[PDB]
Amino acid sequence: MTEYKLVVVGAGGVGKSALTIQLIQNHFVDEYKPTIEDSYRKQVVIDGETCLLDILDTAGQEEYSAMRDQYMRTGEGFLCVFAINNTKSFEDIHQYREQIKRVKDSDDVPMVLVGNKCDLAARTVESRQAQDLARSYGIPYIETSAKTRQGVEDAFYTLVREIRQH
Ligand SMILES: Nc1nc2c(ncn2[C@@H]2O[C@H](COP(=O)(O)OP(=O)(O)NP(=O)(O)O)[C@@H](O)[C@H]2O)c(=O)[nH]1
Ligand SMILES: [Mg+2]
């Protein structure tokens, strides 16, 4: 079957692992547990296609850029994740996208902007500003919560569908 190599990137503590785990194990992880690198494999049916999701979950920590580059290099799509109550994580998005384009040699790579933690009242980044940024990249913007499961399958399946059209 078709395999889609999906890579999850973004600043530390935005919820990259929580989204992945919610998708793979149907539970919300509430623990403090920084990732170095983890990979997940899951067989799914998306729009009737049987495929395999290889999901690489990456570190948010700066010490790990080298490892992050090696892994970004083999991905066919990227979930660029920020948290809606962390404005610095939103600002850091431009820095992650530029690095993706530099390691992939490409202006236009299959990619989804994910605004996560949308279950929280204390929102510092407005959906408007995120939606604007996503428009200026030419990518979809999806709001998610790993806690409620809102938007989770959407964010992942949308990225698969972007790869299929690339
Ligand atoms: N309320 C809420 N909390 C979340 C959500 N997603 C993640 N978190 C919480 O935020 C913290 C960090 O989440 P985690 O998945 O570890 O983040 P990460 O992006 O993988 N961090 P790292 O870059 O270190 O691997 C955890 O306490 C987790 O439960 C969400 O959608 N809502
Ligand atoms: Mg993590």
Beta partners for residue 57, in sequence order: 8, 38
Atom number, ligand 1, closest to the C-alpha of residue 148: 31
Question: Is any atom of ligand 1 closer than 6 Å to the C-beta of 27?
Answer: no
For residue 10 the two structure tokens come to: 């973004």
Q: Which ligand lies nearest the alpha carbon of 92?
A: 1
Q: Residue 13 Cα, ligand 1 centroid: separation in angstroms?
A: 5
Final resolution, Å? 2.0
- CA 4, chain centre distance (Å): 14
For residue 60 the two structure tokens come to: 């948010």
Question: Helix/strand/coil (H, E, C) string of the chain?
Answer: CEEEEEEEEECCCCCHHHHHHHHHHCCCCCCCCCCCEEEEEEEEEECCEEEEEEEEEECCCHHHHHHHHHHHHHCCEEEEEEECCCHHHHHHHHHHHHHHHHHHCCCCCCEEEEEECCCCCCCCCCHHHHHHHHHHHCCCEEECCCCCCCCHHHHHHHHHHHHHCC
Atom number, ligand 1, closest to the C-alpha of residue 18: 15
Q: Residue 48 Cα, ligand 2 centroid: separation in angstroms?
A: 30
105 burial class (0-12, 13-18, 19+ CB within 10 angstroms)? exposed
For residue 70 the two structure tokens come to: 């090696």
Question: Going from the N-terminus, what domains does the chain have, and what CATH number goes with each?
Answer: 3-165 (3.40.50.300)
- Type of residue found at 39: S
For residue 49 the two structure tokens come to: 């296609």
Cα distances (Å, whole numbers) of residue 159 to 66, 80, 85, 122, 145: 24, 11, 24, 27, 17
Q: Residue 59 Cα, ligand 2 centroid: separation in angstroms?
A: 6
Question: Is any atom of ligand 1 closer than 6 Å to the C-beta of 151?
Answer: no
Residue 136 CB: number of other CB atoms within 10 A?
8
Question: Is any atom of ligand 1 closer than 6 Å to the C-beta of 60?
Answer: yes
